[PDB]
Amino acid sequence: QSKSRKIAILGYRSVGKSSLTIQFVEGQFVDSNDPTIENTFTKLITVNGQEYHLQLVDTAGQDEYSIFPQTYSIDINGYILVYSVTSIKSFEVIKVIHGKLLDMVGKVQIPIMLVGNKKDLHMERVISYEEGKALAESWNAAFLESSAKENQTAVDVFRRIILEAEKLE
Ligand SMILES: Nc1nc2c(ncn2[C@@H]2O[C@H](COP(=O)(O)OP(=O)(O)NP(=O)(O)O)[C@@H](O)[C@H]2O)c(=O)[nH]1
Ligand SMILES: [Mg+2]
């Protein structure tokens, strides 16, 4: 049997939302992408013996002034909130996006996963692992660091959001 679940991937511009999603879906790293308008993939994945049809909504980068789109606040089973460990701006912005998201969804509990991407860029890192982890803990959210170059880290991100969604019955 298969379960159908819809996941939105959100964050600031150029944090690697598309590259992470593509690494998961297609198993390859894309060196340069167009800025996203909106893409949607359906990917088969098994989590704890359960097969899922994952509908993955890869969204346009938002900044702190972006209206959080209402279409992403209904009928979504899980959220992946992505920043880059190389960008302080992306980290400030993900805090704003999170607040707007929580406003939109209202009194329904939603699974949220915070992801610090581009961890392979050691020389450009400006955010520690610990600051990301502390933020996730304050949100009661899952936390992982990832690299879109590293297939296992991308797979782990999508498995984890599913694990978290399942916990909410
Ligand atoms: N070294 C490294 N580069 C990455 C990683 N993730 C993304 N990039 C690079 O960073 C740039 C932006 O990636 P992209 O996936 O387009 O980011 P995005 O969040 O989808 N941008 P947008 O919000 O405009 O749709 C690309 O050049 C991409 O190859 C990563 O984990 N490591
Ligand atoms: Mg993109």
Question: What order do the helices and strands come in, and which of them pair?
Answer:
Layout: E1 2-11, H1 17-26, E2 38-47, E3 50-59, E4 78-84, H2 88-105, E5 112-117, H3 129-138, E6 142-145, H4 151-167
Parallel strand pairs: 1-3, 1-4, 4-5, 5-6
Antiparallel strand pairs: 2-3
Helix pairs in contact: 1-4
Membrane topology: Lipid-anchor
Binding site for GDP: 14-19, 30-31, 117, 120, 148
Motif (Effector region): 33-41
Main sheet, how many strands, which sense, barrel?
A: 6 strands, mixed
Report the end-to-end length measured between terminal Cα atoms: 18 Å
Helix amount:
25-40%
Gross geometry:
globular
Question: According to CATH, what is the topology?
Answer: Rossmann fold
Strand content: 25-35%
Order of helices and strands: EHEEEHEHEH
The ligands bound in this entry are: phosphoaminophosphonic acid-guanylate ester, magnesium ion
Class, according to the CATH hierarchy? Alpha Beta
Count of helix runs: 4
Shape-level CATH architecture: 3-Layer(aba) Sandwich
Structural class: alpha/beta
| Count of discrete domains | 1
Total strands: the figure is 6
- CATH homologous superfamily classification: P-loop containing nucleotide triphosphate hydrolases
What is the strand arrangement across the widest sheet? 2-3-1-4-5-6
Task: Return Rg in Å.
Answer: 15 Å
